[PDB]
Amino acid sequence: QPTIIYTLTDEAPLLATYAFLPIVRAFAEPAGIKIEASDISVAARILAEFPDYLTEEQRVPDNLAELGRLTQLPDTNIIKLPNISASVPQLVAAIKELQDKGYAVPDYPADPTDQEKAIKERYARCLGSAVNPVLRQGNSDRRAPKAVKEYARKHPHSMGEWSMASRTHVAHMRHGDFYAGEKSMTLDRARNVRMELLAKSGKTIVLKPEVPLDDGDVIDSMFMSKKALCDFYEEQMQDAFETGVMFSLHVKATMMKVSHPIVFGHAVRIFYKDAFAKHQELFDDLGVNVNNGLSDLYSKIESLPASQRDEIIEDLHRCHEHRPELAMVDSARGISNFHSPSDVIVDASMPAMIRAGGKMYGADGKLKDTKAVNPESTFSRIYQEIINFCKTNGQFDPTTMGTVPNVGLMAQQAEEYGSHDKTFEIPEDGVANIVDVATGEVLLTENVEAGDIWRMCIVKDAPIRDWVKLAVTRARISGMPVLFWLDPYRPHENELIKKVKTYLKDHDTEGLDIQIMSQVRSMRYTCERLVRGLDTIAATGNILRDYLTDLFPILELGTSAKMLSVVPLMAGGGMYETGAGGSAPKHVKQLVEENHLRWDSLGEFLALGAGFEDIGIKTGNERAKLLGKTLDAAIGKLLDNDKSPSRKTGELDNRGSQFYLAMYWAQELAAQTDDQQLAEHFASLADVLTKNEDVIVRELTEVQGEPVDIGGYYAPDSDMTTAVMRPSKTFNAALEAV
Numbered sequence: 001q002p003t004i005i006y007t008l009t010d011e012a013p014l015l016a017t018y019a020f021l022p023i024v025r026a027f028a029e030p031a032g033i034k035i036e037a038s039d040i041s042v043a044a045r046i047l048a049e050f051p052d053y054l055t056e057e058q059r060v061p062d063n064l065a066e067l068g069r070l071t072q073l074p075d076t077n078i079i080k081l082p083n084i085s086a087s088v089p090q091l092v093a094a095i096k097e098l099q100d101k102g103y104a105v106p107d108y109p110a111d112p113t114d115q116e117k118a119i120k121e122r123y124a125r126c127l128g129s130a131v132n133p134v135l136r137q138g139n140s141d142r143r144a145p146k147a148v149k150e151y152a153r154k155h156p157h158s159m160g161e162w163s164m165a166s167r168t169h170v171a172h173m174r175h176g177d178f179y180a181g182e183k184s185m186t187l188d189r190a191r192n193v194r195m196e197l198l199a200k201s202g203k204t205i206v207l208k209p210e211v212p213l214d215d216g217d218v219i220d221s222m223f224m225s226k227k228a229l230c231d232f233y234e235e236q237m238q239d240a241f242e243t244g245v246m247f248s249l250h251v252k253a254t255m256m257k258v259s260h261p262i263v264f265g266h267a268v269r270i271f272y273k274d275a276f277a278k279h280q281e282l283f284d285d286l287g288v289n290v291n292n293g294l295s296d297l298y299s300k301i302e303s304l305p306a307s308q309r310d311e312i313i314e315d316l317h318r319c320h321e322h323r324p325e326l327a328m329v330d331s332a333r334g335i336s337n338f339h340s341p342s343d344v345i346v347d348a349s350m351p352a353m354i355r356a357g358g359k360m361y362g363a364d365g366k367l368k369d370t371k372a373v374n375p376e377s378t379f380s381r382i383y384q385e386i387i388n389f390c391k392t393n394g395q396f397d398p399t400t401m402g403t404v405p406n407v408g409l410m411a412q413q414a415e416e417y418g419s420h421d422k423t424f425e426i427p428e429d430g431v432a433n434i435v436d437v438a439t440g441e442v443l444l445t446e447n448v449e450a451g452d453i454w455r456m457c458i459v460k461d462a463p464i465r466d467w468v469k470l471a472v473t474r475a476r477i478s479g480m481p482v483l484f485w486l487d488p489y490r491p492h493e494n495e496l497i498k499k500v501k502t503y504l505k506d507h508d509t510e511g512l513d514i515q516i517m518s519q520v521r522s523m524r525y526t527c528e529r530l531v532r533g534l535d536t537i538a539a540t541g542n543i544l545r546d547y548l549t550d551l552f553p554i555l556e557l558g559t560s561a562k563m564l565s566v567v568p569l570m571a572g573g574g575m576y577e578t579g580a581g582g583s584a585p586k587h588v589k590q591l592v593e594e595n596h597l598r599w600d601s602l603g604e605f606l607a608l609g610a611g612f613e614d615i616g617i618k619t620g621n622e623r624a625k626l627l628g629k630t631l632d633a634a635i636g637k638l639l640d641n642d643k644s645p646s647r648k649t650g651e652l653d654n655r656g657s658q659f660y661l662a663m664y665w666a667q668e669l670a671a672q673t674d675d676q677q678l679a680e681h682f683a684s685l686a687d688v689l690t691k692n693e694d695v696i697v698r699e700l701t702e703v704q705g706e707p708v709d710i711g712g713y714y715a716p717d718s719d720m721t722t723a724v725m726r727p728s729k730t731f732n733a734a735l736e737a738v
């Protein structure tokens, strides 16, 4: 019997799931589809990491590992909702919540003894992007379905106006970064390699004892110079200061050492260098680590009195006299860009800024132009290109702009997403080599200094072949041209270009428009096509998959959540991600304090539809196909009637939107002529929901406008949460009536 695995994650999509999962079960049941919820929240992965601190009834199965195993089975069907890639501050808050709820888990040891070392290494498995590289055992097919795009045309979202006199720009390192020192090769034979450091002292230091590589694999060695980074930060801060432009920092602190986000910490320390020069000793003696953001500092600071503490505060603020204005995460609560490494994440933050007309919030609460610092230049030039494009051509127009589907290479922890266990902080000056364990042959070499970050990346041949095949597939299906975003001046992408040229001859590409251009040129070409209403498929790497699928859909649709995101698993299974965005922690706020969830579940709906249709196609379950068809049509009706959630408290939210979806779905099922008994089963529900529409709607807007308790954040209580998320007794009783 068919099983759909439905992920329980964190925050907004979690709450939405508390309001929607009962609906899904009530619809999947008549079709003999089991709905199996899998808790992969941060709290859950924590508990699953530490069972030897837990009781009998407290313990939790390693659900992530289970899903991992499931990815290798043909009959697997996963609805993946966005989940938190926890930073250390978030991990800490979560741990606090658990312990306070009586789960007595060990504290996180920032500075460890030898047991606490081990528990830190264990807690590392709960840090950063721990889910997606496991689940993503196929390449990415992301695109906006035509009904969604047409809704976007009929009801354009707010788009910030772009000034030709905008001073907004991207500052990135022009030397000393991963890009500049990158080296790359394609293996001709299977090899086993070692990442080691030839210290100038003569001593060899091994950082990675063994990395198995396959024939045809593309590997890269890259490093970021600490000297170059810190100098870069200094010069950019001074430029921003002199020009009077607001400083912002846009990085992925999780694609780095999640325990030691060096790129972030250095920015913080250099910004406040005048303060840090005066309290270095006390900060060290306090265990201060601004790699986990300025927040960390503040925490360690609280134990102090208010004489040498307010002196610190005064020094930190004194630093603002010589440093530029600083972009804010929350102007109301005084949350700056430096507060936490995870607040401002490049993939979401840059598009947000571009959508705003090149602007972010300063301390005063106003939108201003910004120097958007993306230290790593590898994938940030494209942002400067689209920014100059907006400065020149004004903001985009969702009513007329074309679309940019993405075919993303990500299968088997491809590239930088798989380099978590091959990323090191260089301990001392010397030569960083990748050597054959058998021959001792140096495959790749870099000259590195102490404090540098050295990374090895791998992308395997089979995912590349499937990536090209998916590109061609999508080109032939959609009739859109395909553009491979590959910079031949980047060694990795050059190797990939060889791959693509080779594998394009393994498919009928006759009458297909398939080109390869550099990332910047590809971005430019794509925009020039966009403003003309022309479509272009972006066939890209993993990072670019992330970046572009946040950027373009936000411009086109207001949010990347309204996207179709299908991962055809290598083993034949299916994963369907509910959009391309994250867990939207800002929505949780408005919910807990105003009982309005502005989370759009359209991504869940689309993903679910694709899932049902695929189950139907694979198993020959006609009823599954019927659920697919009827759900897609019901989504069409949801869009036609603009029953999407509103931002405003007191107006339609996630729950009412879900209700309308249920209604339309029921109607579509009562109207179909393929399964009479099914039509009969859903006729009753359809009539009940259609009859009591105003009653249920009213029941859903009643509760709106008042603070609400879900009994937690990282581990909210199921019953309280379900009490809040399903407050319509009428609706609930209608669903319970089967």
Ligand SMILES: NC(=O)c1ccc[n+]([C@@H]2O[C@H](COP(=O)([O-])OP(=O)(O)OC[C@H]3O[C@@H](n4cnc5c(N)ncnc54)[C@H](OP(=O)(O)O)[C@@H]3O)[C@@H](O)[C@H]2O)c1
Pocket: 081, 082, 083, 084, 085, 086, 132, 342, 343, 344, 345, 348, 349, 559, 560, 561, 579, 580, 581, 582, 583, 584, 585, 586, 587, 598, 599, 600, 601, 603
């Ligand atoms: N695939 C994944 O699992 C995945 C991917 C990316 C990020 N994440 C995680 O998500 C967390 C937060 O990421 P972030 O704050 O950088 O970006 P984000 O979660 O995408 O949220 C940024 C903004 O996008 C809009 N948005 C996102 N999803 C929406 C939806 N379903 N309906 C309506 N609007 C939506 C919201 O804007 P408004 O405030 O204007 O409504 C939201 O504040 C991070 O911890 C990150 O690790 C997970």
